[PDB]
Amino acid sequence: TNSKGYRRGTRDMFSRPFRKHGVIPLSTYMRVFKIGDIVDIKGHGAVQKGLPYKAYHGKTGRIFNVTQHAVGVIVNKRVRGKILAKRVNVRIEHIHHSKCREDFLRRVKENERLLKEAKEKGQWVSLKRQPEQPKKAHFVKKLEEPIALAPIPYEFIA
Amino acid sequence: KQISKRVAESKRRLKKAAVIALRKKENLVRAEKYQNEYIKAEQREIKLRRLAKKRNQFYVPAEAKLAFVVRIRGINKVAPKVRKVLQLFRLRQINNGVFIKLNKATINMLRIAEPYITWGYPNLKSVRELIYKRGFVKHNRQRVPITDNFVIERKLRQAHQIQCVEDLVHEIFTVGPNFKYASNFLWPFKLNTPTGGWRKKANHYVNGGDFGNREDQINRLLRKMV
Amino acid sequence: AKSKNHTNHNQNKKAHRNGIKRPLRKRHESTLGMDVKFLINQRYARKGNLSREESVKRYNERIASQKGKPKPVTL
Amino acid sequence: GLLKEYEVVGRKLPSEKEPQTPLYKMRIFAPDNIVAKSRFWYFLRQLKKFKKTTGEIVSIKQVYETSPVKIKNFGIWLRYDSRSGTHNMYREYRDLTVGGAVTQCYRDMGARHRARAHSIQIIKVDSIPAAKTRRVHVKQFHDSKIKFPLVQRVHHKGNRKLFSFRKPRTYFQ
Amino acid sequence: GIDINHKYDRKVRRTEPKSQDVYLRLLVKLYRFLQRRTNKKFNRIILKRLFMSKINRPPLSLQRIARFFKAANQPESTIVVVGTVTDDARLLVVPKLTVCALHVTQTARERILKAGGEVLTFDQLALRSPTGKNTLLLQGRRTARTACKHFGKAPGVPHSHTRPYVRSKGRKFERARGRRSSCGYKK
RNA sequence: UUGUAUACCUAUACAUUACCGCUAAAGUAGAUGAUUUAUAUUACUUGUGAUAUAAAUUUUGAAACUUUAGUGAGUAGGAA
RNA sequence: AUAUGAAGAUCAAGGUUAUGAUAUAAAUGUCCCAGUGGGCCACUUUUGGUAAGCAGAACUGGCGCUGUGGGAUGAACCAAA
RNA sequence: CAUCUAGUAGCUGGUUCCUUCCGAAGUUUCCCUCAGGAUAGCUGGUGCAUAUAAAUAAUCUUAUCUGGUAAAG
RNA sequence: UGUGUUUAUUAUAUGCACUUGUAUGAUUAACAAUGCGAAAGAUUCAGGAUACCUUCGGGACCCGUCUUGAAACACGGACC
């Protein structure tokens, strides 16, 4: 009967990776964080100041604040069963940029590049994503060394 | 004023049966175009298979759109991720059938919801017999049988281009661009029970028979249920 | 006599009924616990917008009177 | 059911890095073709990589015994799972069709070795002539001229008369 | 077996007033006819607000009605209040206004009439505007109630400011531990 | 007992239908010569419209009638 | 050293609202409204215990609160509410 | 013996008409608290705001981040 | 798409008067047999757990209660 307290169970959460110990690379402090930016939390065990508490590791929020060393990130925690949006002041070394939306934003960049040159053709602009449709009718040619090439089900004996 | 009411409501009566007689004439020339599409499609696949044998190849025919999906089991003892796929497929009762498009986003819902469901790939005859005999339709949240083409046309002709029954059979069978509307217009097909009944209901079709993809044997089972 | 304490049984049935509830999406989220010197006369970066189009596209040529600030901003 | 044979062919659908994957084929015995396309995948997952979803089923076609009234001995190379137990067998049956001998083997294993059918892999099935069979209960029938007097009939139950007046009499003369 | 019919399957609107006033239910007789036969959402607002309670039909001032009537391009409209219209003594000059209300207060009646404009009932409005043309549909501020300030109290959050239920005013009345940092904490 | 085959029997489940409720939606309120319907004279289009003369139905406990759909387990408990 | 930052406030220009399926009507307040706060069974994973129709937990489904069909019989199993 | 006295009881027992509709809980924290509360959850009632899209909200597909359990060593 | 070559198939061009031919706008409607609701009172046909009795097949434990679980070898209850 514990969780309680504050870095418990984080023997593997705030560990370092293997041979990624030591000095922090310098671009970690050279990243720019503007208000309203999507941001993951993966805490740094080698920076003992401004670590998020363990519920928020692995999560994802939006930057609501910038101060001199940290960003306020607003993160969702399910406190059962309901979702509060938690405001967590977290230092910059524990904070990353989300890649999730900058491969949505390279489609807004193409839902206006492809609708641009569609002023000549007209249609279909085809600006929606399609799931993996079932395949087609297609003519598999053999030739290729005609078949059989015939498996039979056999591997036991030892 | 009533001296103008026979003046107004006798051309509103003459024009009314000029529309209905106009749309009687479209729906014969419309459904003749559709019925010729299906005949050319079938003789194509016969022509293609017979060519690829002579050209010493294979002809892999097209993987299928249009599942017809029946709910075969239970509303008791069901898990929440499989209870939730069966409310998104509108399958809330035993022998409820709906029409489903086969994109990868829904096959992985047909695999989540597998032991409570059978599905397969309908004929044209099975598309017709389910909409002719069993096809009801949704009119301002109410369930309205068919009985004429005005129940289909009054809700799907300004937006979409569906006025007949064979319209609704067209953009469901050949999966057309208004399939989303052609199959949510319907109610779920409240099917009977088979004649001769079932096989096991809790083994796969490929084990010894029932749930999951029967795949062409959904037709034989709809003869019993329709 | 010491019977049966601690279970998360029924606790997600009972928490999914009135559902599991996203907060709600606001166009105006609060500025509180936010950087106060970022805010305190950016209160007056709003209050300095006495006009924004009439007297302001006068300024596009009023500073182009001195040809703008095109060079010396480059440090 | 009755277990007719098929040739299921499969590919590994060719991502553009690889053109024209090598096309393996089979001899699947199955009640129907929906179950022959999960016996193809079960047997090929032992042999090559490409499961489904990452493969294709090229032509599954049924093969129609090439002499349905000629009379021939079928040897079946099998392997099964007993209770302690992966083994091999070589069983011999006497039939006219080749799906009818395989189905005469799926009952016999159920009778004699309790072998519920998900345990049986079939390696090979042949039509061995005679003086290559071994299996003494098949060599009984490899001699013209064979006689055997019959004792076998139907004896309806209850009958066209339940309380009979004239005694069936298993014998006469 | 089918699924699954808790609520609010049965919708919890009103379909009638809870009100045995006969003059009020004669206006429900008009406005069901007026809503059904002119399908204006003006007449459906009047009908649905004619069903409502004493809360949800708050009063409205004579000075808030004179000041919503600085709506531009509207010199000739009618002020519609399904509710009451109270006098304001903080309004020194009453303009020339056309007011339709259930209860217009008595001193609000004379200051409208000495200006002078119209007090109308909702059947003098059904004849003048059966579709609610030339109308300013106004209600009072619902949560101006004192009871609304008491919804609802549980300290910890800097939103709270939500008015405890307490018999008298002064110190000795809920002002020490939890109100005051030198007594326990501040809330 | 093991492996199969057809053919049956069996729920309050499923389908259709009749009836009860509940839910949800929709309609109806010129009575003064108001609305129709069947005939009987005239303007006229061939036909319809209008005046006139020949029988009824309707003052829907507006909390009423009328129309259509779905739906139905229940202790503690709440509510009509 | 920029009244180019960064936030904000405005005018400009942008085909087809940018996977799928669904919509049991969803949203929001108030009575902080009643009862409850002994639970128990099962697959799977588990700890203690030689074991237990024993003790303790995670997960989802059940009985409690529920008839009816099947397992002769039976709280919970199979089917179905 | 009579009164105070119908003393108190987190405990046992009982608690009186029908139909219709909706439908629990055995968990949280805290308490000289462990046969009991208060608390939050679950319930019902009553509304109200929106009916001749591009409003959103919930299981999959896609994109991305997270994880040290099975296996492996 | 285009045009002809062409050979096939559907649709529209059925007005006036009449009639025991569909949705009767959840259709069930016809031919025929039996039997007359006698002035006071019979009879014919169909129906009826009226409170029973007779007969038979299926079902069927004793309620209230606290309880995870009651027919319980848990407690209460002989009857008005």
Side-chain angles (χ1 to χ4, degrees), chain E residues 144-164:
Chain E
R145 326 210 278 128
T146 311
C148 291
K149 288 157 188 234
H150 296 269
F151 312 148
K153 182 49 194 153
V157 180
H159 90 273
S160 208
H161 321 115
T162 160
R163 282 251 193 160

PDB file of all heavy atoms in Angstrom, chain E residues 144-164:
ATOM      1  N   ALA E 144     -29.964  37.092 -12.563  1.00  0.00           N
ATOM      2  CA  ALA E 144     -29.803  38.234 -11.707  1.00  0.00           C
ATOM      3  C   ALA E 144     -30.351  37.924 -10.353  1.00  0.00           C
ATOM      4  O   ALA E 144     -30.405  38.803  -9.494  1.00  0.00           O
ATOM      5  CB  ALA E 144     -30.500  39.455 -12.289  1.00  0.00           C
ATOM      6  N   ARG E 145     -30.802  36.695 -10.176  1.00  0.00           N
ATOM      7  CA  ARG E 145     -31.361  36.277  -8.916  1.00  0.00           C
ATOM      8  C   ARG E 145     -30.273  36.228  -7.881  1.00  0.00           C
ATOM      9  O   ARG E 145     -29.112  35.971  -8.184  1.00  0.00           O
ATOM     10  CB  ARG E 145     -31.988  34.905  -9.033  1.00  0.00           C
ATOM     11  CG  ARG E 145     -32.605  34.632 -10.331  1.00  0.00           C
ATOM     12  CD  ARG E 145     -33.734  33.695 -10.168  1.00  0.00           C
ATOM     13  NE  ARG E 145     -33.323  32.315 -10.093  1.00  0.00           N
ATOM     14  CZ  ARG E 145     -33.685  31.484  -9.140  1.00  0.00           C
ATOM     15  NH1 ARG E 145     -34.456  31.883  -8.148  1.00  0.00           N
ATOM     16  NH2 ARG E 145     -33.252  30.262  -9.165  1.00  0.00           N
ATOM     17  N   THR E 146     -30.671  36.498  -6.648  1.00  0.00           N
ATOM     18  CA  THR E 146     -29.817  36.299  -5.503  1.00  0.00           C
ATOM     19  C   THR E 146     -29.550  34.836  -5.270  1.00  0.00           C
ATOM     20  O   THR E 146     -28.454  34.463  -4.864  1.00  0.00           O
ATOM     21  CB  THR E 146     -30.511  36.934  -4.343  1.00  0.00           C
ATOM     22  OG1 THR E 146     -30.905  38.233  -4.764  1.00  0.00           O
ATOM     23  CG2 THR E 146     -29.603  37.031  -3.149  1.00  0.00           C
ATOM     24  N   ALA E 147     -30.515  33.994  -5.600  1.00  0.00           N
ATOM     25  CA  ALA E 147     -30.369  32.567  -5.425  1.00  0.00           C
ATOM     26  C   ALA E 147     -29.292  32.000  -6.321  1.00  0.00           C
ATOM     27  O   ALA E 147     -28.707  30.970  -6.001  1.00  0.00           O
ATOM     28  CB  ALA E 147     -31.696  31.874  -5.700  1.00  0.00           C
ATOM     29  N   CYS E 148     -29.003  32.661  -7.425  1.00  0.00           N
ATOM     30  CA  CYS E 148     -28.025  32.189  -8.389  1.00  0.00           C
ATOM     31  C   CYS E 148     -26.598  32.417  -7.940  1.00  0.00           C
ATOM     32  O   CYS E 148     -25.696  31.740  -8.418  1.00  0.00           O
ATOM     33  CB  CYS E 148     -28.259  32.884  -9.714  1.00  0.00           C
ATOM     34  SG  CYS E 148     -29.736  32.417 -10.523  1.00  0.00           S
ATOM     35  N   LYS E 149     -26.373  33.363  -7.053  1.00  0.00           N
ATOM     36  CA  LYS E 149     -25.057  33.611  -6.508  1.00  0.00           C
ATOM     37  C   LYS E 149     -24.597  32.525  -5.553  1.00  0.00           C
ATOM     38  O   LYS E 149     -23.397  32.390  -5.310  1.00  0.00           O
ATOM     39  CB  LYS E 149     -25.098  34.947  -5.811  1.00  0.00           C
ATOM     40  CG  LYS E 149     -25.180  36.056  -6.759  1.00  0.00           C
ATOM     41  CD  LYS E 149     -25.758  37.242  -6.120  1.00  0.00           C
ATOM     42  CE  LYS E 149     -26.000  38.295  -7.143  1.00  0.00           C
ATOM     43  NZ  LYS E 149     -25.339  39.558  -6.738  1.00  0.00           N
ATOM     44  N   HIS E 150     -25.530  31.759  -5.008  1.00  0.00           N
ATOM     45  CA  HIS E 150     -25.273  30.645  -4.129  1.00  0.00           C
ATOM     46  C   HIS E 150     -25.068  29.344  -4.859  1.00  0.00           C
ATOM     47  O   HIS E 150     -25.020  28.318  -4.198  1.00  0.00           O
ATOM     48  CB  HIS E 150     -26.423  30.463  -3.177  1.00  0.00           C
ATOM     49  CG  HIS E 150     -26.641  31.604  -2.245  1.00  0.00           C
ATOM     50  ND1 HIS E 150     -26.054  31.680  -1.008  1.00  0.00           N
ATOM     51  CD2 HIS E 150     -27.463  32.667  -2.328  1.00  0.00           C
ATOM     52  CE1 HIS E 150     -26.466  32.766  -0.393  1.00  0.00           C
ATOM     53  NE2 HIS E 150     -27.317  33.389  -1.177  1.00  0.00           N
ATOM     54  N   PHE E 151     -24.934  29.349  -6.179  1.00  0.00           N
ATOM     55  CA  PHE E 151     -24.635  28.141  -6.947  1.00  0.00           C
ATOM     56  C   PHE E 151     -23.209  28.228  -7.491  1.00  0.00           C
ATOM     57  O   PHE E 151     -22.919  29.123  -8.282  1.00  0.00           O
ATOM     58  CB  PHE E 151     -25.582  27.942  -8.132  1.00  0.00           C
ATOM     59  CG  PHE E 151     -27.030  28.094  -7.845  1.00  0.00           C
ATOM     60  CD1 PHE E 151     -27.859  28.583  -8.821  1.00  0.00           C
ATOM     61  CD2 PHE E 151     -27.604  27.668  -6.653  1.00  0.00           C
ATOM     62  CE1 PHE E 151     -29.225  28.726  -8.577  1.00  0.00           C
ATOM     63  CE2 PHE E 151     -28.974  27.812  -6.413  1.00  0.00           C
ATOM     64  CZ  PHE E 151     -29.778  28.328  -7.385  1.00  0.00           C
ATOM     65  N   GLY E 152     -22.295  27.354  -7.072  1.00  0.00           N
ATOM     66  CA  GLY E 152     -22.297  26.558  -5.847  1.00  0.00           C
ATOM     67  C   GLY E 152     -20.878  26.434  -5.235  1.00  0.00           C
ATOM     68  O   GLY E 152     -19.856  26.513  -5.945  1.00  0.00           O
ATOM     69  N   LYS E 153     -20.832  26.138  -3.931  1.00  0.00           N
ATOM     70  CA  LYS E 153     -19.701  26.416  -3.039  1.00  0.00           C
ATOM     71  C   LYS E 153     -18.863  25.182  -2.754  1.00  0.00           C
ATOM     72  O   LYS E 153     -19.387  24.204  -2.234  1.00  0.00           O
ATOM     73  CB  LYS E 153     -20.268  27.007  -1.734  1.00  0.00           C
ATOM     74  CG  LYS E 153     -19.332  27.416  -0.690  1.00  0.00           C
ATOM     75  CD  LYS E 153     -18.316  28.240  -1.289  1.00  0.00           C
ATOM     76  CE  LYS E 153     -17.232  28.364  -0.363  1.00  0.00           C
ATOM     77  NZ  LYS E 153     -16.078  28.592  -1.178  1.00  0.00           N
ATOM     78  N   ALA E 154     -17.566  25.242  -3.075  1.00  0.00           N
ATOM     79  CA  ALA E 154     -16.552  24.306  -2.539  1.00  0.00           C
ATOM     80  C   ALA E 154     -15.105  24.806  -2.683  1.00  0.00           C
ATOM     81  O   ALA E 154     -14.405  24.473  -3.660  1.00  0.00           O
ATOM     82  CB  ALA E 154     -16.661  22.906  -3.155  1.00  0.00           C
ATOM     83  N   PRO E 155     -14.609  25.466  -1.643  1.00  0.00           N
ATOM     84  CA  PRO E 155     -13.558  26.470  -1.732  1.00  0.00           C
ATOM     85  C   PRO E 155     -12.433  26.464  -2.732  1.00  0.00           C
ATOM     86  O   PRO E 155     -12.204  27.502  -3.346  1.00  0.00           O
ATOM     87  CB  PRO E 155     -12.977  26.364  -0.336  1.00  0.00           C
ATOM     88  CG  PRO E 155     -14.155  26.233   0.470  1.00  0.00           C
ATOM     89  CD  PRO E 155     -15.126  25.446  -0.279  1.00  0.00           C
ATOM     90  N   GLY E 156     -11.781  25.333  -2.952  1.00  0.00           N
ATOM     91  CA  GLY E 156     -10.353  25.284  -3.226  1.00  0.00           C
ATOM     92  C   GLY E 156      -9.817  26.033  -4.409  1.00  0.00           C
ATOM     93  O   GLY E 156      -8.611  26.226  -4.538  1.00  0.00           O
ATOM     94  N   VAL E 157     -10.726  26.493  -5.255  1.00  0.00           N
ATOM     95  CA  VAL E 157     -10.440  26.880  -6.627  1.00  0.00           C
ATOM     96  C   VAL E 157     -10.609  28.392  -6.712  1.00  0.00           C
ATOM     97  O   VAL E 157     -11.549  28.957  -6.129  1.00  0.00           O
ATOM     98  CB  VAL E 157     -11.353  26.108  -7.603  1.00  0.00           C
ATOM     99  CG1 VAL E 157     -11.102  26.473  -9.067  1.00  0.00           C
ATOM    100  CG2 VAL E 157     -11.169  24.626  -7.427  1.00  0.00           C
ATOM    101  N   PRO E 158      -9.748  29.092  -7.462  1.00  0.00           N
ATOM    102  CA  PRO E 158      -9.875  30.543  -7.523  1.00  0.00           C
ATOM    103  C   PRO E 158     -10.999  31.010  -8.429  1.00  0.00           C
ATOM    104  O   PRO E 158     -11.049  32.188  -8.794  1.00  0.00           O
ATOM    105  CB  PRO E 158      -8.492  30.992  -8.015  1.00  0.00           C
ATOM    106  CG  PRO E 158      -7.868  29.817  -8.598  1.00  0.00           C
ATOM    107  CD  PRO E 158      -8.453  28.630  -7.999  1.00  0.00           C
ATOM    108  N   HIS E 159     -11.904  30.112  -8.805  1.00  0.00           N
ATOM    109  CA  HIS E 159     -13.120  30.530  -9.477  1.00  0.00           C
ATOM    110  C   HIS E 159     -14.191  30.971  -8.503  1.00  0.00           C
ATOM    111  O   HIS E 159     -15.082  31.735  -8.914  1.00  0.00           O
ATOM    112  CB  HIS E 159     -13.691  29.401 -10.351  1.00  0.00           C
ATOM    113  CG  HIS E 159     -14.670  28.489  -9.655  1.00  0.00           C
ATOM    114  ND1 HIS E 159     -14.283  27.384  -8.933  1.00  0.00           N
ATOM    115  CD2 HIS E 159     -16.022  28.505  -9.598  1.00  0.00           C
ATOM    116  CE1 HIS E 159     -15.345  26.753  -8.473  1.00  0.00           C
ATOM    117  NE2 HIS E 159     -16.413  27.424  -8.847  1.00  0.00           N
ATOM    118  N   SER E 160     -14.084  30.546  -7.229  1.00  0.00           N
ATOM    119  CA  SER E 160     -15.261  30.136  -6.483  1.00  0.00           C
ATOM    120  C   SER E 160     -16.257  31.258  -6.237  1.00  0.00           C
ATOM    121  O   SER E 160     -17.208  31.385  -7.017  1.00  0.00           O
ATOM    122  CB  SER E 160     -14.827  29.525  -5.180  1.00  0.00           C
ATOM    123  OG  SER E 160     -15.778  28.595  -4.759  1.00  0.00           O
ATOM    124  N   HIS E 161     -15.973  32.137  -5.278  1.00  0.00           N
ATOM    125  CA  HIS E 161     -16.729  33.369  -5.023  1.00  0.00           C
ATOM    126  C   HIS E 161     -18.235  33.186  -4.926  1.00  0.00           C
ATOM    127  O   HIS E 161     -19.004  34.045  -5.335  1.00  0.00           O
ATOM    128  CB  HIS E 161     -16.389  34.413  -6.065  1.00  0.00           C
ATOM    129  CG  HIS E 161     -14.946  34.411  -6.423  1.00  0.00           C
ATOM    130  ND1 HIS E 161     -14.496  34.075  -7.675  1.00  0.00           N
ATOM    131  CD2 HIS E 161     -13.846  34.640  -5.674  1.00  0.00           C
ATOM    132  CE1 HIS E 161     -13.180  34.104  -7.683  1.00  0.00           C
ATOM    133  NE2 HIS E 161     -12.761  34.454  -6.486  1.00  0.00           N
ATOM    134  N   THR E 162     -18.659  32.102  -4.312  1.00  0.00           N
ATOM    135  CA  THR E 162     -20.013  31.604  -4.472  1.00  0.00           C
ATOM    136  C   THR E 162     -20.814  31.500  -3.191  1.00  0.00           C
ATOM    137  O   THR E 162     -21.490  30.503  -2.976  1.00  0.00           O
ATOM    138  CB  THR E 162     -19.992  30.266  -5.189  1.00  0.00           C
ATOM    139  OG1 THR E 162     -21.207  29.565  -4.951  1.00  0.00           O
ATOM    140  CG2 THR E 162     -18.906  29.493  -4.720  1.00  0.00           C
ATOM    141  N   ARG E 163     -20.779  32.542  -2.353  1.00  0.00           N
ATOM    142  CA  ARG E 163     -21.869  32.976  -1.469  1.00  0.00           C
ATOM    143  C   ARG E 163     -22.451  31.928  -0.534  1.00  0.00           C
ATOM    144  O   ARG E 163     -23.360  31.197  -0.919  1.00  0.00           O
ATOM    145  CB  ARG E 163     -23.007  33.573  -2.267  1.00  0.00           C
ATOM    146  CG  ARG E 163     -22.763  34.950  -2.732  1.00  0.00           C
ATOM    147  CD  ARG E 163     -23.577  35.963  -2.048  1.00  0.00           C
ATOM    148  NE  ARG E 163     -23.468  37.196  -2.792  1.00  0.00           N
ATOM    149  CZ  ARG E 163     -24.310  38.212  -2.731  1.00  0.00           C
ATOM    150  NH1 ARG E 163     -25.359  38.190  -1.937  1.00  0.00           N
ATOM    151  NH2 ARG E 163     -24.095  39.255  -3.490  1.00  0.00           N
ATOM    152  N   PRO E 164     -21.892  31.735   0.640  1.00  0.00           N
ATOM    153  CA  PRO E 164     -22.429  30.752   1.573  1.00  0.00           C
ATOM    154  C   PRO E 164     -23.767  31.172   2.195  1.00  0.00           C
ATOM    155  O   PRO E 164     -24.122  32.343   2.233  1.00  0.00           O
ATOM    156  CB  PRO E 164     -21.308  30.701   2.593  1.00  0.00           C
ATOM    157  CG  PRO E 164     -20.776  32.011   2.566  1.00  0.00           C
ATOM    158  CD  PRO E 164     -20.747  32.434   1.206  1.00  0.00           C
TER     159      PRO E 164
END
